[PDB]
Ligand binder design. Structure first.
Ligand SMILES: Nc1nc2c(ncn2[C@H]2C[C@H](O)[C@@H](COP(=O)(O)OP(=O)(O)OP(=O)(O)O)O2)c(=O)[nH]1
Ligand SMILES: [Ca+2]
Ligand SMILES: [Ca+2]
Ligand SMILES: [Ca+2]
Ligand SMILES: [Ca+2]
Length: 342
DNA sequence: GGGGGAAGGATTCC
DNA sequence: CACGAATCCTTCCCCC
């Protein structure tokens, strides 16, 4: 069958910051996203393991991080930089297999089925790849290897950080019955709970439930997905993913429902969005708002043609107005998203 | 009954 | 509650 090798870069953003300023190694490093509402308002994008040991991780408020680690190194997120480093590493991987799926800024899958035979050679190829990336970009990564993408990923999670692991056909059979359903990619907290209310704590448990009831609880796609995995039949092909949308969203100094007060933020979002679009022309635009109670509302429109900067501006305000008149809540974050590229 | 789209929301965290 | 992008779901709507 198919042999998949998954690469996931270790504590990536923070590690890139270490590569660019080596003295940082050994010290707790936290990459922050400062919202500008107040001094250290915002959240953590990621932290290195020195910092994670004490509970400082992605998603917690920067303020909470500083209470725990007042003397750690706090850096503003520099996405562009991390993206360029990522691209280079992806190019190196692209040399080990043409069948590659760049799943995100820091992970990719390679179909090495006709590149090696048996897991042994696969394992050796993983070490070659780890060594090559460490040598070329001084970045440590974790390799996951199995028969399909979901398990290759799971193997990497199990080997984090700077590890490599193979989950052979026998171990998969074991995991299908031993693994906590919540540790399965695609199963967030909302799905974990529904599956719990169904008596489904492991993958195998999805086989002892009437499909119709499963489908009714979590949806058909997710249901067929889990059953497929449980039947040891999951086998999605590794394929090139293409960017389908580009957008920007900013946090406003203060929460507001005032149009003239919100426009500047919206227009700044549009400007960045367009620059990032580069030479892409979208036919669809969506105005996205995050309300005072962290809920997310959006309004959009598809055009029978490409959207120009002027159009985007004009339309953005109409969609923003539609949002204000339709949701009595104050707006905290405002932005845009362009999709359906020509 | 059913295709095809579009819109807005749900969920994931890749 | 203290920060970008993909996929899937429900609800409409138009119409063969
Ligand atoms: N802004 C923001 N960025 C995130 C968040 N989560 C992840 N990222 C970014 C920065 C992370 O370094 C990068 C890769 O995510 P990972 O889940 O693989 O974590 P990282 O690679 O940081 O740690 P790891 O060694 O894989 O456990 O994506 C988040 O919650 N907010
Ligand atoms: Ca990673
Ligand atoms: Ca990752
Ligand atoms: Ca989970
Ligand atoms: Ca994550």
């Amino acid at each position: 069958h198919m042999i998949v090798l998954f690469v996931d870069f270790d504590y990536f953003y923070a590690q890139v910051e270490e590569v660019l300023n080596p003295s940082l190694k050994g010290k707790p490093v936290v990459v922050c996203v400062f919202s500008g509402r107040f001094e250290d308002s915002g959240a953590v994008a990621t932290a290195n393991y020195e910092a994670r040991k004490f509970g400082v991780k992605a998603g917690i408020p920067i303020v909470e991080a500083k209470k725990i680690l007042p003397n750690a190194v706090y850096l503003p997120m520099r996405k562009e930089v991390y993206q360029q480093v990522s691209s280079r590493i992806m190019n190196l991987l692209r040399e080990y297999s043409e069948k590659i799926e760049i799943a995100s800024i820091d992970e990719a899958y390679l179909d090495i089925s006709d590149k090696v035979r048996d897991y042994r050679e696969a394992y050796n190829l993983g070490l070659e790849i780890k060594n090559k990336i460490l040598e070329k970009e001084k970045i440590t990564v974790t390799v996951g290897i199995s028969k399909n993408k979901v398990f290759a990923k799971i193997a990497a999670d199990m080997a984090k950080p700077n590890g490599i692991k193979v989950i052979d056909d026998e171990e998969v059979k074991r995991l299908i019955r031993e693994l906590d359903i919540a540790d399965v990619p695609g199963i967030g907290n909302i799905t974990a709970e529904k599956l719990k209310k169904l008596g489904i704590n492991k993958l195998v448990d999805t086989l002892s439930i009437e499909f119709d009831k499963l489908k009714g609880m979590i949806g058909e796609a997710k249901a067929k997905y889990l059953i497929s995995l449980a039947r040891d039949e999951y086998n999605e092909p590794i394929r090139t993913r293409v960017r389908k949308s580009i957008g920007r969203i900013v946090t406003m100094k203060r929460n507001s429902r005032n149009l003239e007060e919100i426009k500047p933020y919206l227009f700044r979002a549009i400007e960045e969005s367009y620059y990032k679009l580069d030479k892409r022309i979208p036919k669809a635009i969506h105005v996205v708002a995050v309300t005072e109670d962290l809920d997310i509302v959006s309004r959009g429109r598809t055009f029978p043609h490409g959207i120009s900067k002027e159009t985007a501006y004009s339309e953005s305000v109409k969609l923003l107005q539609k949002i204000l008149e339709e949701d009595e809540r104050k707006i905290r974050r405002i932005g845009v998203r362009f999709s359906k590229f020509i």
